[PDB]
Each structure stands twice: as C-alpha cells, then as structure tokens.
C-alpha cells in the first residue's frame, strides 16, 4: 500500500516548502519514495524518523496546475511503480 502525508523540502538555496510525500511499507519500515510539488527546483527532502534524515531527490517528472514528481535517490523500481500506480488514481 501507499501512504500519503506531507513533508518539508529544500531548493538549492535552502528555501523550504511543504510538499506531499508518498511512502510504502516494507519489512515494517516506512520508506519515503516520492514527493510532489508545484516547485520544479527542489533538491532534497527532510524525512522525520532518530532525528531528521535529509534525502536527495532525482530530477522531477512534470505533469501538466502543473505537478512535479520527484523520486528519492536510489529507491527501487518496484517501490517507484507502487507510487506511480497510486498517483494514476489520484
């Protein structure tokens, strides 16, 4: 299943903004897989867990108001596909 909430991301300059965040559950753990935003220049996102983990974002997909989808760096194709399946319904 895919779980949705929000999280805070950063652009290159470090300016913060609130983004929608998409998680899957594997082996009990909640894995942040993707975020969406209207901003196209986000670089990392803060995941809250044992403090804050700061994760790198892949360059975004653009869906056209306009929504940018960023996958978290190195996340597996199967996990990416789960989120894509969930969002194609959203």
TrEMBL record:
Residue intervals of the Nsp9 ssRNA-binding domain: 1-90
Signal peptide: none
Localization, UniProt: Host cytoplasm, Host perinuclear region; Host endoplasmic reticulum-Golgi intermediate compartment; Host membrane
Function (record text): RNA-directed RNA polymerase that catalyzes the transcription of viral genomic and subgenomic RNAs. Acts in complex with nsp7 and nsp8 to transcribe both the minus and positive strands of genomic RNA. The kinase-like NiRAN domain of NSP12 attaches one or more nucleotides to the amino terminus of NSP9, forming a covalent RNA-protein intermediate that serves as transcription/replication primer. Forms a primer, NSP9-pU, which is utilized by the polymerase for the initiation of RNA chains. Interacts with ribosome signal recognition particle RNA (SRP). Together with NSP8, suppress protein integration into the cell membrane, thereby disrupting host immune defenses.
Family designation: Belongs to the coronaviruses polyprotein 1ab family.
Protein name: ORF1ab polyprotein
Organism, scientific name: Porcine coronavirus HKU15
Lineage: Viruses, Riboviria, Orthornavirae, Pisuviricota, Pisoniviricetes
């Amino acid at each position: 299943n895919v779980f949705t909430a929000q999280n805070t991301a950063q652009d290159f300059n470090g300016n913060e903004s609130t983004v929608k965040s998409f998680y899957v559950t594997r082996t009990g753990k909640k894995i942040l897989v993707a975020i969406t935003s209207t901003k196209d220049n986000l670089k990392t996102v803060t995941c809250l867990t044992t403090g804050k983990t700061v994760l790198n974002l892949d360059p975004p997909m653009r869906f056209a108001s306009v929504v940018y989808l960023y996958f978290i760096q190195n996340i597996s194709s199967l996990n990416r596909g789960m989120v894509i399946g969930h969002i194609s319904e959203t």
